[PDB]
Design a protein around this ligand. Structure first.
Ligand SMILES: [K+]
Ligand SMILES: [K+]
Ligand SMILES: [K+]
Ligand SMILES: [K+]
Ligand SMILES: [K+]
Ligand SMILES: [K+]
Ligand SMILES: [K+]
Ligand SMILES: [K+]
Ligand SMILES: [K+]
Ligand SMILES: [K+]
Ligand SMILES: [K+]
Ligand SMILES: [K+]
Ligand SMILES: [K+]
Ligand SMILES: [K+]
Ligand SMILES: [K+]
Ligand SMILES: [Mg+2]
Ligand SMILES: [Mg+2]
Ligand SMILES: [Mg+2]
Ligand SMILES: [Mg+2]
Ligand SMILES: [Mg+2]
Ligand SMILES: [Mg+2]
Ligand SMILES: [Mg+2]
Ligand SMILES: [Mg+2]
Ligand SMILES: [Mg+2]
Ligand SMILES: [Mg+2]
Ligand SMILES: [Mg+2]
Ligand SMILES: [Mg+2]
Ligand SMILES: [Mg+2]
Ligand SMILES: [Mg+2]
Ligand SMILES: [Mg+2]
Ligand SMILES: [Mg+2]
Ligand SMILES: [Mg+2]
Ligand SMILES: [Mg+2]
Ligand SMILES: [Mg+2]
Ligand SMILES: [Mg+2]
Ligand SMILES: [Mg+2]
Ligand SMILES: [Mg+2]
Ligand SMILES: [Mg+2]
Ligand SMILES: [Mg+2]
Ligand SMILES: [Mg+2]
Ligand SMILES: [Mg+2]
Ligand SMILES: [Mg+2]
Ligand SMILES: [Mg+2]
Ligand SMILES: [Mg+2]
Ligand SMILES: [Mg+2]
Ligand SMILES: [Mg+2]
Ligand SMILES: [Mg+2]
Ligand SMILES: [Mg+2]
Ligand SMILES: [Mg+2]
Ligand SMILES: [Mg+2]
Ligand SMILES: [Mg+2]
Ligand SMILES: [Mg+2]
Ligand SMILES: [Mg+2]
Ligand SMILES: [Mg+2]
Ligand SMILES: [Mg+2]
Ligand SMILES: [Mg+2]
Ligand SMILES: [Mg+2]
Ligand SMILES: [Mg+2]
Ligand SMILES: [Mg+2]
Ligand SMILES: [Mg+2]
Ligand SMILES: [Mg+2]
Ligand SMILES: [Mg+2]
Ligand SMILES: [Mg+2]
Ligand SMILES: [Mg+2]
Ligand SMILES: [Mg+2]
Ligand SMILES: [Mg+2]
Ligand SMILES: [Mg+2]
Ligand SMILES: [Mg+2]
Ligand SMILES: [Mg+2]
Ligand SMILES: [Mg+2]
Ligand SMILES: [Mg+2]
Ligand SMILES: [Mg+2]
Ligand SMILES: [Mg+2]
Ligand SMILES: [Mg+2]
Ligand SMILES: [Mg+2]
Ligand SMILES: [Mg+2]
Ligand SMILES: [Mg+2]
Ligand SMILES: [Mg+2]
Ligand SMILES: [Mg+2]
Ligand SMILES: [Mg+2]
Ligand SMILES: [Mg+2]
Ligand SMILES: [Mg+2]
Ligand SMILES: [Mg+2]
Ligand SMILES: [Mg+2]
Ligand SMILES: [Mg+2]
Ligand SMILES: [Mg+2]
Ligand SMILES: [Mg+2]
Ligand SMILES: [Mg+2]
Ligand SMILES: [Mg+2]
Ligand SMILES: [Mg+2]
Ligand SMILES: [Mg+2]
Ligand SMILES: [Mg+2]
Ligand SMILES: [Mg+2]
Ligand SMILES: [Mg+2]
Ligand code: NA
Ligand code: NA
Ligand code: NA
Ligand code: NA
Ligand code: NA
Ligand code: NA
Ligand code: NA
Ligand code: NA
Ligand code: NA
Ligand code: NA
Ligand code: NA
Ligand code: NA
Ligand code: NA
Ligand code: NA
Ligand code: NA
Ligand code: NA
Ligand code: NA
Ligand code: NA
Length: 248
RNA sequence: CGCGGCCCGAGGCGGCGGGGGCGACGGGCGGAACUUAAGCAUAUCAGUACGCCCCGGAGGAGAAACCAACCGGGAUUCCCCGUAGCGGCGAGCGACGCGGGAGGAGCCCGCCCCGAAGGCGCGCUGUGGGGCGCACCGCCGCGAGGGGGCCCGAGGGCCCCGCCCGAGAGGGUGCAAGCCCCGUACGGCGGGCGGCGAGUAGCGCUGCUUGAGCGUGCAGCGCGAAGGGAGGCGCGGCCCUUCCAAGGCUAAAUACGCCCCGGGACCGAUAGCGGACCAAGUAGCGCGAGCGAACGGUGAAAAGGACGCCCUGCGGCCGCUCAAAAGACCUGAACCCGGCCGGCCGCCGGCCCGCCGGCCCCGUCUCGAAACACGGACCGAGGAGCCACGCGCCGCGGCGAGCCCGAGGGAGCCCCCGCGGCGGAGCGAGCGCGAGACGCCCCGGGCCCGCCAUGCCCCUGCGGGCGUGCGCGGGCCGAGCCGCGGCGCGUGGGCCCGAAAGGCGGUGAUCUAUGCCCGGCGAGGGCGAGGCCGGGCGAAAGCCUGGUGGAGGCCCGCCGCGGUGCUGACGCGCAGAUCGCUCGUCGGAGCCGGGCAUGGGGGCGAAAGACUCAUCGAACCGCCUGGUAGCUGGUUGCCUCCGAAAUGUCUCCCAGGACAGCCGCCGCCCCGCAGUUGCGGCCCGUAGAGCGCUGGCCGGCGGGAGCGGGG
RNA sequence: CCGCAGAGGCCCCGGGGGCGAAGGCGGCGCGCAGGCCCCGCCGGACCGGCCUCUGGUGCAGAUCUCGGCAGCAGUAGCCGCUACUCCGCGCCCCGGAGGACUGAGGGGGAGACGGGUUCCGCGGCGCCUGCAUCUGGCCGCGGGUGACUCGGGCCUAAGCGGCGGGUGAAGACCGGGAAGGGGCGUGCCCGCCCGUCGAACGGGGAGCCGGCGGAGACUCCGGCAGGCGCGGCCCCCGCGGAGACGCCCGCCCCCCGGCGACGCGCACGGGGACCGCGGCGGGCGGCGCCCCGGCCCGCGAACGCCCCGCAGCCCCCGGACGCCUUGCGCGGAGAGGGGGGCCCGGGGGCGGACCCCGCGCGUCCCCGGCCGCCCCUGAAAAGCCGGGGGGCGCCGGCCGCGCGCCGUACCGACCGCAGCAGGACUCCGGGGUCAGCAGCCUCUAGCGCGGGAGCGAACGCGGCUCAGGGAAGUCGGCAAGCCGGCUCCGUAACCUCGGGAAAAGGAGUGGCUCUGACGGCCGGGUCAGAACUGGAACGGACGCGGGGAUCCCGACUGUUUACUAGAAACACAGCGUCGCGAGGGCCGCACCCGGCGCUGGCGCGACGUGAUUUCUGCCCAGUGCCACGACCGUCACCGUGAAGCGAUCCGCCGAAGCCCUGGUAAACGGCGGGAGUAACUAUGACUCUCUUAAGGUAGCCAAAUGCCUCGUCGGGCAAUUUCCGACGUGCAUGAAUGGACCAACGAGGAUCCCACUGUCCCGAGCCGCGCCUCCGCGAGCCUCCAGCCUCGGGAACGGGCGAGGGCCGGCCAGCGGGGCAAGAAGACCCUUUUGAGCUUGACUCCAGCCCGGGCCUGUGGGGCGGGGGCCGCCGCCGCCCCGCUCACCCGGUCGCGCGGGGACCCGCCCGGGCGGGGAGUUCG
């Protein structure tokens, strides 16, 4: 046979993300001495649309603390943030929607977004439109805090990791049908080359393990083991069960 | 927080080096497959092709941590000579020592002693010096000797008579030249003590490699030393014989293309190099890597064509130069053709010559070809069992218990000298033992040697002698060595041409597939969604009606973009995919241009195994490669003498082979033969015949002990 | 033995030769033959008998190689693109006259790419210009491309390269962690880190008119302007307004900004150019009759100054149910009103330059303010400018100079072997008819293209008409025909309520003469009505749906086998499952390193089904997958114990895996037989029996799926192997390998009805081109030889052979019975110890991944188990756990005021497991 679609994707070429006309990487403000002691004030300048992304981005201007002038940031906007609003970051930031503060100072039961797994990594956990995390409990003896992820799993992170109050803006996007093939075309034209999708049973044996036969059908079981080598891992990988169980 | 030394680093300046090129030879790495094994996977091809790196006129190797087992040799290289071994123990593969030659050459550093005596801006983290005690090339030149007659366009021709010679090699000149010219032969000049190399040697595990076999050489990882290494079977112990690794240098004898010189039983213009021609790796072909032709000749001398006459010009005639037009050119065949002149159907035979008689188209495979089996329009030229090595047998020559142009050396292609080797004794796994008795020749017996087994005797004793018994090879008064020729087989492209494939290194996204960036484009109509305004109804919620508005992968339709049907035209085309009508779509998942990206078992794919420059169920270019073929086609003069088989056994054998049979040639010897009848002895169970045996099968008539049916 | 080429010898005064060698042509003789010899003619310088030696040594064939050449044959052919004629002069060149065409998406006028001199003048016909040629893109000889303002040179896009270094046997490939530059002017100050690479369409400082040559022009000349620099002379450090703002011009550094700079769309408004109508002036044509009715011309740039400029945005007074668009929209966060400011690719006046006058619909281009749309939001940089703070100081006017390098002719003359009906990007776009940039005719401009004449057979190609009938033709209504514009009337079942729908189906339409309606302080077209009148005619050419009733498949728009398949195949929205929380998942990759990822579960990746509606049954025995399930048995190296001279051998120890215990079917898949039985018969609700992991549920059916089979019954027909409706123990239906149903849609498959017709009964007539005859030009394929039949025998179907019957010789137009006609070493079938693609529970293996030990690799503490009761020595052996930081690793930061892990991981060596993802090979 020849190389499969999954094997060809990993080599780049016509399978790279289309990044032209993107505003940049969205991140929390970097951690420094000024906000390790007090608070730093900024102002929201604009709210913009990012190609490929479902959630809006906000441009926030802060004073420069190692010289003269100003510093421009790029945040993921929580719901309810408006142009001209002033926000704070630091150990002494107040509990308002746009503010950034460490999770140790956030009361249990609060909604947070753009949480950082390890201190000083600039956010990585709740970044897609409509998502949020919950602060569950604190442990002052070990200095660790428990959170609940959008998938429902529970994780322990250090109490010095920062987050933003609120939930990500743009919630409800997936409640509307795409309806037409032309809509999915535009959606994926803003992201990467991955659409439309040809079924494996509709191919010839030379280019997929599912192809061939006098009727269209999968010859064997579709569950493959975890240790299958790269050209073999197609179908359901290491599935614990299959079918529509119906219960919890 | 400052500044001096040492150490470790940074920027600049000066002077010196490096890099790239070379179809051979040389060194170091990486590393195939075709092919053979009648299949194939270990093996082989091959430590090859090819890729990468690096010198030189040579390179590399080199002065024992060597061979050997001897009444020993003694650094490296090159020539002559020849079997241990490895191996689906198959096919295949394969060294070295001893011996004879060419050439010949030896040494250093570290460690140890002194310590700046040194190459002095460096260097004690070591420069410099030493062992300490006993005892063929090039350049320049000169260079002899014939006339007369005849006849030719010109003689180097014919006849007669001469000369030169350290020169009679050759070339030129109007026809075969020692003496017509240049050259050829004969010249000159220049050039006792101290001290021996550590992440090493070795070992364990793993990979490659070798003839190296319980390891030939190398390497990775782990462990890791003091006297050490080797002696072609491992381990432990004790001896003997030999050498001193883990640092370095070195001439000679040897190999070889381009370029220059000489020679040849070589080719002679479809040959010889692809390339004999004032322009060839040229013209021309391909996006590119690459591919790559054809074309020689007047005559001694260009003397390369006078004059004249016709002609509207184009041209023609007549003649001129020359030995000759040999006139763009030597000679000038065949096929095919025009004129004039003679005939009427091919071949063989007879004849007073058109009558009679006979005659299917060759080559090939085949039981069988005129075949409706294949190849062949015609003509010319080219066109296919050669060579090397190995093995067997035959003939001839020389010498003969011997024989022998090895390499090489003597300045003599042909002369002189010149080792192995083979032969001379076999058998046996091996320790080992070891032949006489007869014979024109041949065959056969009989004895003897070795291997195996036995009986008796005895010294020096699992040792000697004598005898006996089967089988296998050898022997009994040596026949070989070298060379030349032939026949057959094997290994090499291997008589000539012919695959579908496999490998190595390179070149392409002008077409086409997908993506990204920058630009551009879409006549005219139809339908009439949300939102908004007026009027009416209603208790309220709300509803009814007229207008406005201008949504949509909506509809009709032009250019564009496609490609349905006629299964129309064309189908030696306009065209290696076109033309005409008819048709699908036409604001969108639309169409078009340029730039850029993805590369071959890879890419790209709204998926047809589609497309990737007329090439895709694996592109193109060159090379391995004249790849292999038990299969199809072809394989070139005459006469004479002999003359088959299409069967048996085995075979991954059934379209092929080996052994036997049939046949040819070459012989040799001298010993009665026969595909026949007659006479004498013995053997066989077929035709026919038959129903005694083994089976089968119609009835008739008698006896009834016993049994059954029925009266 | 004959012959060929060459070597060593002989050839009696030293072989034969211009008194004529080799070779060629014709003719005798000799030899069984292979061959040899002699004679005549041609030719013009070499040749060879005998002996010994040597070899690239003798041709009819190979779909042989190279060269030449025949018949066929004066044959096939010189059919697209409407067309030429008379005279000078010749069908083709030039001129005049006539007749036509392309038809503004041009056979027009110009560029980009590609070509490379094809361009121009003079001359010419040897080649080419498939006929001719006096012509030419052909041949010869001379010429021809001018830039401060146009393009390139500069910028950056998608990309490419470089980078102390890293890796690999190299070639090479990969790359942020590295003491990485300037200024002013000599001393100080500032500063983390690439590119004068990549766009003759994107960005960009500035050009217009007139004229001149033979071939060049935004380039030359004349005139009039712009931009950017340099040098002299004079030469200034801000005022007005109530405000929006105005008016006369400062630079350098740090920071903050702007311009450059950006989507699509139906409409609405403005400007320009084009177009048309009327008037006045100038010129022309025709004129049988009319004609102030026909045609042509009447021009004004860049740039400078002054006025005007709707909508938009802003200022002042003051304090509201008003203002206003086609649509909207706005107002106490300040409307209307009155009075002002700013921008506006534009217009007017005066200059440039001694300007005929008015009016209007439409077309194209550009601009404007709004509104609508997106799970789509519609480039960047050089360069230029402004503001704040700081530091500095003439900065403008006049007058002079200057502006380097390269492209530049011409062409669809380009690619397809060619002067090939193919392919090949863009710009400008008149009149009439009309909805129209459609079709048809035409002004401007261009131009008669592989040649002509005759004739008017068959037959072909492209067209036309046809009595009566009307699908009877045929596999099949294939082909052709019918319909069609606009206005009015009228439109069913069904439906996802949006459609169906132009459903179906009717009627009207010309010309002329009139009437009314709709604006403005002249104009315009449109809509409606009436009389009259033409062969019972009017969308009079052109352009332009035939319709209806049903079944199957796919929801729909879309895509596909370039060159035989456009579909029911693929895609699709929707639905469902599975994996992953970054120290992760999936993939690339020889190594170093990469992609998703400028990402973070409303995400990313892997699969199946395939809109809506209604549903989606039972089975975990098999195979697969999964257990932070369990360590039962087995299962490595290493380690450790016993024995041994040693090599070694025997035990223990026991990671993953398997085994074991469970879960899982929108995982792969699977889903039964035999008997008896109800008051006629028949059937079987019911009973018995064997048996599975479970025994096919809801549905559906002789279906695109039913062998038997043309199943049985009903409908439709005169008559039906077709079609529709039912029936069902269904060879072998069936539930996301999805079941059933379905409005809209379809160059999809199928049956019937209306209308229509040469499809047919059954053919006839006609038009143009070819054919045919002529002048000019002029090939391919094929070919053992030949070319009349019947029978026989024969490789079993003869042109030839045996026996009979016929036939002078030579040609033409046609034709398709033969020549087993041609085109190709059968692709079907078999064999060969010949392949390749693909599969897997064939056999032998490899990457990759998982798991264990050792090295890398430090510094401390502790627990357990082994060397009647222990106590062990504190040194012996194993396994295990918890710290610290210094190795090692990861993150943040411009190293401006700091983190996370950690002796584990990673890497390397050896060992075990998984492993059609991949490789090689076999398949008597
Ligand atoms: K799919
Ligand atoms: K080898
Ligand atoms: K045959
Ligand atoms: K045949
Ligand atoms: K011999
Ligand atoms: K390939
Ligand atoms: K046989
Ligand atoms: K009997
Ligand atoms: K440019
Ligand atoms: K020009
Ligand atoms: K899907
Ligand atoms: K199971
Ligand atoms: K069925
Ligand atoms: K019936
Ligand atoms: K269709
Ligand atoms: Mg398919
Ligand atoms: Mg497969
Ligand atoms: Mg199929
Ligand atoms: Mg230097
Ligand atoms: Mg070979
Ligand atoms: Mg073989
Ligand atoms: Mg073979
Ligand atoms: Mg083979
Ligand atoms: Mg070998
Ligand atoms: Mg050397
Ligand atoms: Mg002389
Ligand atoms: Mg001479
Ligand atoms: Mg030493
Ligand atoms: Mg080997
Ligand atoms: Mg020994
Ligand atoms: Mg040497
Ligand atoms: Mg030649
Ligand atoms: Mg005769
Ligand atoms: Mg006869
Ligand atoms: Mg043959
Ligand atoms: Mg045969
Ligand atoms: Mg036969
Ligand atoms: Mg024959
Ligand atoms: Mg010949
Ligand atoms: Mg003898
Ligand atoms: Mg050959
Ligand atoms: Mg070959
Ligand atoms: Mg192979
Ligand atoms: Mg390209
Ligand atoms: Mg392209
Ligand atoms: Mg729209
Ligand atoms: Mg549409
Ligand atoms: Mg056709
Ligand atoms: Mg034809
Ligand atoms: Mg790859
Ligand atoms: Mg005979
Ligand atoms: Mg066998
Ligand atoms: Mg009998
Ligand atoms: Mg002569
Ligand atoms: Mg020869
Ligand atoms: Mg011949
Ligand atoms: Mg003709
Ligand atoms: Mg016309
Ligand atoms: Mg031009
Ligand atoms: Mg010209
Ligand atoms: Mg020319
Ligand atoms: Mg410019
Ligand atoms: Mg310029
Ligand atoms: Mg550039
Ligand atoms: Mg531009
Ligand atoms: Mg000028
Ligand atoms: Mg010009
Ligand atoms: Mg020009
Ligand atoms: Mg070409
Ligand atoms: Mg053309
Ligand atoms: Mg019919
Ligand atoms: Mg019929
Ligand atoms: Mg039709
Ligand atoms: Mg469809
Ligand atoms: Mg469609
Ligand atoms: Mg096709
Ligand atoms: Mg088709
Ligand atoms: Mg049922
Ligand atoms: Mg059925
Ligand atoms: Mg039915
Ligand atoms: Mg049917
Ligand atoms: Mg019918
Ligand atoms: Mg079934
Ligand atoms: Mg199910
Ligand atoms: Mg099914
Ligand atoms: Mg015949
Ligand atoms: Mg006959
Ligand atoms: Mg015919
Ligand atoms: Mg015929
Ligand atoms: Mg064949
Ligand atoms: Mg064939
Ligand atoms: Mg066989
Ligand atoms: Mg194979
Ligand atoms: Mg395989
Ligand atoms: Na070099
Ligand atoms: Na040299
Ligand atoms: Na010749
Ligand atoms: Na001559
Ligand atoms: Na015969
Ligand atoms: Na044959
Ligand atoms: Na033939
Ligand atoms: Na004897
Ligand atoms: Na349409
Ligand atoms: Na297929
Ligand atoms: Na070959
Ligand atoms: Na002769
Ligand atoms: Na030959
Ligand atoms: Na004219
Ligand atoms: Na038109
Ligand atoms: Na979707
Ligand atoms: Na099955
Ligand atoms: Na294949």
């Amino acid at each position: 046979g020849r190389r499969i679609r999954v094997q060809r994707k990993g080599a780049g070429s016509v399978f790279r993300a289309h990044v032209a006309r993107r505003l940049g990487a969205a991140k929390l403000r970097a951690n420094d001495f000024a906000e390790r002691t007090g608070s730093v004030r900024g102002v929201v300048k604009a709210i913009l649309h990012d190609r490929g992304r479902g959630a809006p981005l906000a441009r926030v201007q802060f004073p420069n603390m190692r010289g003269e002038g100003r510093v421009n940031e790029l945040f993921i906007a929580p719901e309810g943030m408006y142009t001209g609003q002033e926000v704070f970051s630091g150990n002494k930031a107040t509990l308002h929607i746009g503010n950034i503060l460490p999770v140790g100072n956030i009361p249990e039961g609060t909604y947070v977004c753009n949480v950082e797994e390890k201190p000083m990594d600039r956010g990585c956990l709740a970044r897609a439109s409509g998502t949020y995390c919950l602060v569950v409990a604190h442990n002052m003896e070990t200095n660790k805090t428990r959170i609940r992820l959008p998938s429902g799993q529970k994780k322990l992170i250090s109490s010095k990791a920062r987050a933003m109050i609120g939930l990500v803006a743009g919630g409800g996007r997936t409640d509307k049908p795409l309806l037409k093939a032309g809509n999915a075309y535009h959606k994926y034209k803003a992201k990467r080359n991955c659409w439309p999708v040809v079924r494996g049973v509709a191919m010839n044996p030379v280019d997929h393990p599912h192809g061939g036969g006098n009727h269209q059908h999968i010859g064997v079981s579709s569950c493959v083991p975890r240790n299958a080598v790269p050209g073999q891992k197609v179908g359901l990988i290491a599935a614990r069960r299959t079918g529509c169980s119906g219960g919890k």
